[PDB]
Amino acid sequence: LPNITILATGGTIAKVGVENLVNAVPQLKDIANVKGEQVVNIGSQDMNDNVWLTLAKKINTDCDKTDGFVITHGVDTMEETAYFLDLTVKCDKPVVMVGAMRPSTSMSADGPFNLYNAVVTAADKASANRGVLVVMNDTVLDGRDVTTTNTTDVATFKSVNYGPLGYIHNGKIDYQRTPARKHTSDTPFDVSKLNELPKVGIVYNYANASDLPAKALVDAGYDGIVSAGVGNGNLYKSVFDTLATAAKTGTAVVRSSRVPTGATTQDAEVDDAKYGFVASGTLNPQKARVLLQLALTQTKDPQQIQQIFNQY
Amino acid sequence: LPNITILATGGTIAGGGDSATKSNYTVGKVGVENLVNAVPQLKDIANVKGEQVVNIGSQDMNDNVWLTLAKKINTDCDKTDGFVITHGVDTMEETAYFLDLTVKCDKPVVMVGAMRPSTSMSADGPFNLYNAVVTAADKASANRGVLVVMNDTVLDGRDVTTTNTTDVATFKSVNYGPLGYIHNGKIDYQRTPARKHTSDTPFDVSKLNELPKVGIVYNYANASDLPAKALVDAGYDGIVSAGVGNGNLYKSVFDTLATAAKTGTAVVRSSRVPTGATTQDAEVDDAKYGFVASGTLNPQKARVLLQLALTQTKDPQQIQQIFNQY
Amino acid sequence: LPNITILATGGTIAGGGDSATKSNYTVGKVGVENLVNAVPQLKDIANVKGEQVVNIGSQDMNDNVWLTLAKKINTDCDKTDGFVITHGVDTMEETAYFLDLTVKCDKPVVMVGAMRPSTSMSADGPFNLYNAVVTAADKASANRGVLVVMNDTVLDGRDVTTTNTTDVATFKSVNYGPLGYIHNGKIDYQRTPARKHTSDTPFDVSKLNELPKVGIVYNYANASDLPAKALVDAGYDGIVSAGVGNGNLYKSVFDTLATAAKTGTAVVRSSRVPTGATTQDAEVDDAKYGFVASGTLNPQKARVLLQLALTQTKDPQQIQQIFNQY
Amino acid sequence: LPNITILATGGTIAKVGVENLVNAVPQLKDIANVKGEQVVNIGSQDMNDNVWLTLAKKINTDCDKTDGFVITHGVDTMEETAYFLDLTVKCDKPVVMVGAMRPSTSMSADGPFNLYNAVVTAADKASANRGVLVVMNDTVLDGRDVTTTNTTDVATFKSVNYGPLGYIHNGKIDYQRTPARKHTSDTPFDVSKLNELPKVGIVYNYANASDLPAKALVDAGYDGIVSAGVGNGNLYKSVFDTLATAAKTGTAVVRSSRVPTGATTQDAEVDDAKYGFVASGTLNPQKARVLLQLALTQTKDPQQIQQIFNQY
Ligand SMILES: NC(=O)C[C@H](N)C(=O)O
Numbered sequence A, D: 001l002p003n004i005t006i007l008a009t010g011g012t013i014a015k016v017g018v019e020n021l022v023n024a025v026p027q028l029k030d031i032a033n034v035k036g037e038q039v040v041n042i043g044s045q046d047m048n049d050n051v052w053l054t055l056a057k058k059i060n061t062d063c064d065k066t067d068g069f070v071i072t073h074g075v076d077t078m079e080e081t082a083y084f085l086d087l088t089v090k091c092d093k094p095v096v097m098v099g100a101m102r103p104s105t106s107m108s109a110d111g112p113f114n115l116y117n118a119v120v121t122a123a124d125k126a127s128a129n130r131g132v133l134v135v136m137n138d139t140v141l142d143g144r145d146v147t148t149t150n151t152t153d154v155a156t157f158k159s160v161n162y163g164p165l166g167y168i169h170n171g172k173i174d175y176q177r178t179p180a181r182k183h184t185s186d187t188p189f190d191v192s193k194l195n196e197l198p199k200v201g202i203v204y205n206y207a208n209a210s211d212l213p214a215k216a217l218v219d220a221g222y223d224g225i226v227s228a229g230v231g232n233g234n235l236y237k238s239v240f241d242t243l244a245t246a247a248k249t250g251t252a253v254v255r256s257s258r259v260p261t262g263a264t265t266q267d268a269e270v271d272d273a274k275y276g277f278v279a280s281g282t283l284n285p286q287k288a289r290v291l292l293q294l295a296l297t298q299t300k301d302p303q304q305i306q307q308i309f310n311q312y
Numbered sequence B, C: 001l002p003n004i005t006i007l008a009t010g011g012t013i014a015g016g017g018d019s020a021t022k023s024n025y026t027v028g029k030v031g032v033e034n035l036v037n038a039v040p041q042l043k044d045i046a047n048v049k050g051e052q053v054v055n056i057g058s059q060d061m062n063d064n065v066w067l068t069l070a071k072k073i074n075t076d077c078d079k080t081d082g083f084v085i086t087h088g089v090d091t092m093e094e095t096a097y098f099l100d101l102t103v104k105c106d107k108p109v110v111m112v113g114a115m116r117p118s119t120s121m122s123a124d125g126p127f128n129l130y131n132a133v134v135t136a137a138d139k140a141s142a143n144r145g146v147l148v149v150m151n152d153t154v155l156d157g158r159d160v161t162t163t164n165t166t167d168v169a170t171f172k173s174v175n176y177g178p179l180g181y182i183h184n185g186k187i188d189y190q191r192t193p194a195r196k197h198t199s200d201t202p203f204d205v206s207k208l209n210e211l212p213k214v215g216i217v218y219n220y221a222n223a224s225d226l227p228a229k230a231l232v233d234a235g236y237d238g239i240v241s242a243g244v245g246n247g248n249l250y251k252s253v254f255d256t257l258a259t260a261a262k263t264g265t266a267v268v269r270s271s272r273v274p275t276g277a278t279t280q281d282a283e284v285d286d287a288k289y290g291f292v293a294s295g296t297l298n299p300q301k302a303r304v305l306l307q308l309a310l311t312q313t314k315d316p317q318q319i320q321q322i323f324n325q326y
């Protein structure tokens, strides 16, 4: 039976401790020897750079001591942690994240079977070399494309652009897809000796949008700003003016979109080369922030950041 | 044949690039007469009159174009059988909900745009405009509130949103679904929005020169409170939170909006999550902080209702009631 | 607290396997009392009374269980405040539309099932049944026709379908969207089906012992006409075509149904395609062949309406009118 | 510039001849030298075994004479032809199928840009070794998972279980996925010397379903029957009884589902081993018929057919 390490971080799936979660699912003994460690116990709405750095280093350090990792986490920023670990984890043994939309005490609580299926996924050797995974609602989702689509639905987690890697049925996964984008040990991002990440903020676009958010970030000397643009990454004129300034003043600017699916493209309405802006592609704002932080540990050059956004 | 007025505001439906193949284009560069003349079959279904209100990308849409549109429809109601509004896709869902809450004309108001420019191969704008006129000319379209017609579908202004950056099929009513489908110039309506719209709302913009100041802040891991603080320091009437999950806030953002709400800033919890209600009775004690829960209203759509709510009241209980009825 | 009757028919909500982990299970093996007793919180929202009508997998649902359900609801209407019907997922969308067209009780009728057996880890059935009772007990649920409540969502019997073989979230109203969403025991209704249902339909099954014979044939490349010929040779009252695309037929299948329609078999074009109307004024001259276009009705749902239509009339024009109103 | 062969078969994208279709899109000269051949001019509702056999042999024979193939086809059975060619084509040069929901003469006709994007896809060398493709609505879809989801929508074609391979924007594709299931030259199906396929029929399940369709197929001595089951591939009792008989009497039986997404699984309500039935997995009825016909050119053994349904 596989040795599987659960790293617990909190979320609705749990204040409840790592060992209690395991004990609630005695069928885990059927498929793995599971050891639990508490990393934090926080709502993922309070997830932060320090936790991300902790997790990346803990998995990188303990890779050779276990066969697989399950990370119990909140739903709210699961998609941000998953893509951060996707880009920084050098362990090519399965790393699976799981949470729950309903608490332990709720009718038809989703947590137990979710944890079960996450351990099935971490225990499957076919799961190796697919990068960091999210397993929710009997589905195996790659850390780059996966996102929460509904505020309360148990089926919230979907890979809305490129689809899932595999479905789980009766403790077995039929894997039919693997992410082409470079992940884990195929990325140059090395966080082993970092204690902080570049400061990257996100501003929202809408009708009559204020430039004051964008100006507060520039005024604070932020390393990068992601735009949650309208439609194909477009910018209200005030926000465009403040970000045009930012980009030629030592702030990297990424155009993403508030629109829940599809790429922010080059060659549409915005001359990215003229402004020194970067097109996020299918990365939504919060994912674009992840990659922009990491790109900025290697470069400040807008053209080299665009190459990163085309590769990872 | 019914009298239909097109009020043009620009958008990619009125855009052009130098190639029919290349994705490059500039917006709001073609007049309404040009859009009308690219749909020769329009004569078969309506007496079309075009007026050019503005010629902008909807990325530059603003309060003043909203007040101008609402006042014009309300003023001209008795002069026409229906309105079509040519507009950009990017903020269509915002304009549509604004007009849905402020127009008192109960004759069909239909918005329409296009994802491909007028210059491109298989341009979507011509059939979209044909289908928007069909809808505007349909007696059954009346008393449904303000509509968006895109990709053979009639959507209500409240739930309608753009779901994809490039796809001609992008416009969907992601929570409650479309009102009807258009085939061969006919509509089978099976739904009407229950939320109050148009002549059933108390919002009157006929005398208004401006709208209350409402901003949107994004939540994410390690979110800066600096955007929230910038809006509070400029004395904003309202802030909408694009929350994570069921409208949750990073602790820094939480503390700044809690403080803001105690000095009388209106604060609405919405969600960055593309579908589902931001509910009461979740992780946030709204009554305790004087916050308002957006329901199915996404952050940009919650702004619209919060701006109009702040023209009646600054009370968080009464703003909650408004978010439960409109 | 309102009086709610559960009429149990079996389904996976009443299923069990020897493992909480393994996918193996057998259906309709648990009584209603057992389902009631696994939802202790039901006492908080209703006075629940269970009656076991049948105990079957919905894969074995049939005309006689449909007549038994409709007659029982109609008979007992005055004895209760609402009905919940525990049923399998597989044919729920068929039963739901049958009852939507035949029940004259305008008190909430709510159907509910589960994708995981009662024995499985994170079983969906207990919260599903809680949420089906909430809906049945909600005064606002009345006059909406027959409902399906699954995964925190209230769906109308006409548009509701199962979209996934295993997913707890499978039930969706794929053309016109849900009626409301349930959070913390409360419902925000924003839609009601416009098609006529319940006390607005002319269909009366109170005296009926049987339903007219209606079969379904599948279209595909190189489709055999043998299924179609088998139904015609047994003198079927109606055939529904699961067409390709916009309800198109392979030429062999076409020729057999054309022939059948000229001897008085009712023939409805539906589509194997999971969303969208099978329209008139496409590739098939329906008036020429005496065919009927199903609209948004999928083949199994078109059967339901064709069976009930054939109890009033065998005329293709009047069956077309029925498919345009119900 | 790539040499690209268009094989025309009909559909709404066209009675209009192969050369007229090309001439309507003069921008094709920008991206390929395109030669057109008329194979048939039929509505794809009348697609048939003979056409499938023609196409497979024509592409296999002409592989070395061109850089890429585009097949113009009706929407209605596009998903059946695509999966047939996916399994029988030995050319690992791009094979792209395209159609249109609207005719040439319609307002905002989709055909022109659809054909353009199909040639972009056939001309891209990154398209090679992904198996037979469908390009519709700016999307590249694998021939196995792709299906029509709406009767009239231009965006009808989707890979509803595993998602698309790539999006097309400005004549370029960002490919992020490839089908894992074995296709083209990785399959043993060889149709080069076949003039007919095994007779496989499809029967529909619903409440009070007649056994008469299933009995007519058995009575005709059909080689196989696919069940479009209810839910997870289940069978109305009458249909189950007639198919239990078929399976032990020289008819292969495949359990598929009328439900538009998800696998028909083993280990649910049906003892497949006891009945000698095969579970289709994510193959819908009409796709299951494709693979069942081809499996039956190699074997009649239910256990060997199940292995085929687990591999292709
Ligand atoms: N269901 C959840 O996990 C929500 C919670 N606020 C979290 O993300 O931690």
Ligand SMILES: NC(=O)C[C@H](N)C(=O)O
Pocket (backbone or CB within 6 Å): A231, A234, A269, B010, B011, B012, B013, B027, B056, B057, B058, B059, B087, B088, B089, B090, B091, B113, B114, B115, B116
């Ligand atoms: N397709 C479009 O219309 C996009 C454009 N930027 C607009 O919103 O005006």
Ligand SMILES: NC(=O)C[C@H](N)C(=O)O
Pocket (backbone or CB within 6 Å): C010, C011, C012, C013, C027, C056, C057, C058, C059, C087, C088, C089, C090, C091, C113, C114, C115, C116, D231, D234, D269
């Ligand atoms: N989940 C389910 O209920 C499936 C079952 N075969 C039924 O329809 O009775």
Ligand SMILES: NC(=O)C[C@H](N)C(=O)O
Pocket (backbone or CB within 6 Å): C245, C248, C283, D010, D011, D012, D013, D042, D043, D044, D045, D073, D074, D075, D076, D077, D099, D100, D101, D102
């Ligand atoms: N749009 C289409 O192609 C439909 C047509 N009946 C076909 O498949 O040939």
